[PDB]
Amino acid sequence: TLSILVAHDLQRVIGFENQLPWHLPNDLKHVKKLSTGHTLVMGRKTFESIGKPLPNRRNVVLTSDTSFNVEGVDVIHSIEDIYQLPGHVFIFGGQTLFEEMIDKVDDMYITVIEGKFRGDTFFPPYTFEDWEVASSVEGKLDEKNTIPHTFLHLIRK
Ligand SMILES: NC(=O)C1=CN([C@H]2O[C@H](COP(=O)(O)OP(=O)(O)OC[C@H]3O[C@@H](n4cnc5c(N)ncnc54)[C@H](OP(=O)(O)O)[C@@H]3O)[C@@H](O)[C@H]2O)C=CC1
Ligand SMILES: CCc1nc(N)nc(N)c1C#C[C@H](C)c1cc(OC)cc(-c2ccncc2)c1
């Protein structure tokens, strides 16, 4: 199973100056439940922006740097190596790798942030004519989650 896993705002912003533009604890928990025990694949810049591999799952970084090495991180140098990864594989970021993978994945787990943030990194355009809405769940607002958001699982028609 090959999935995209992304949070993006109303204009598909996913990042600003190496940071997430929003603070949404419920989405981090969403990320944890989906991807714990499985595989996250990310381009080099997305990994560096995070700074450490995420615990309790395989962390795979795509880069052309043959000296890249980080404890707890498996390195690949080719898009085609993604297809040899066993198990459930989530494409995690960033804009470049999403552009390379959006036409290849089976499904996408999107968190739509119902806001307009300043961004410099974007998720590719996509149309619902190509994706069936398997589920759409509104996140709950509270104390620490103050931006409306929606969990979409989209599956390729
Ligand atoms: N929500 C998110 O995902 C967030 C992520 N970002 C990041 O995304 C922003 C935009 O950068 P980006 O390019 O989208 O990030 P990215 O896609 O995570 O990193 C791109 C890098 O991945 C490597 N790469 C990609 N395709 C490859 C291929 N076919 N073969 C070999 N290596 C390949 C290469 O690393 P190289 O070979 O150069 O070492 C390239 O420069 C950056 O400012 C980051 O901070 C921003 C903040 C939040
Ligand atoms: C969660 C946000 C998020 N949600 C969803 N549904 N999919 C995603 N692909 C990401 C994401 C992301 C990027 C890689 C990111 C950037 C970052 O820049 C600091 C910190 C984190 C991060 C810090 C702590 N724990 C998990 C992830 C993630």
Numbering used by the authors: 1 to 157
From the paper:
DHFR is an enzyme vital for cellular replication, mainly due to its important role in the one-carbon metabolism pathway. DHFR reduces dihydrofolate (DHF) to tetrahydrofolate (THF). Nicotinamide adenine dinucleotide phosphate (NADPH) is required for this catalytic reaction. The mutation F98Y in Staphylococcus aureus dihydrofolate reductase (SaDHFR) confers resistance to the clinically important antifolate trimethoprim (TMP).
At that time, the NADPH in R-27 complex was thought to be in its α configuration (α-NADPH). Further refinement of the SaDHFR:R-27 structure was needed to assess the fit of t-NADPH into the NADPH binding site. Upon refinement of these two structures in phenix, we observed that the t-NADPH cofactor better satisfied both the local electron density map and difference density that arose in the α-NADPH structure. Additionally, we observe a decrease in the average cofactor B-factors (from 39.98 with α-NADPH to 33.55 with t-NADPH) and the B-factors of the oxygen atom involved in cyclization (from 39.22 with α-NADPH to 34.15 with t-NADPH). Furthermore, there is an overall decrease in Rfree for the structure with the remediation of the NADPH cofactor, with a decrease from 0.2543 with α-NADPH to 0.2529 with t-NADPH, a meaningful decrease given the minor structural differences between cofactor structures. Computing difference density based on the original assignment of α-NADPH revealed an unsatisfied region of density at the site of ring-closure, which is satisfied by reassignment of t-NADPH. Thus, we created two new, improved structure models with significant implications in terms of biological physical chemistry (discussed herein). Both new structures were deposited in the PDB.
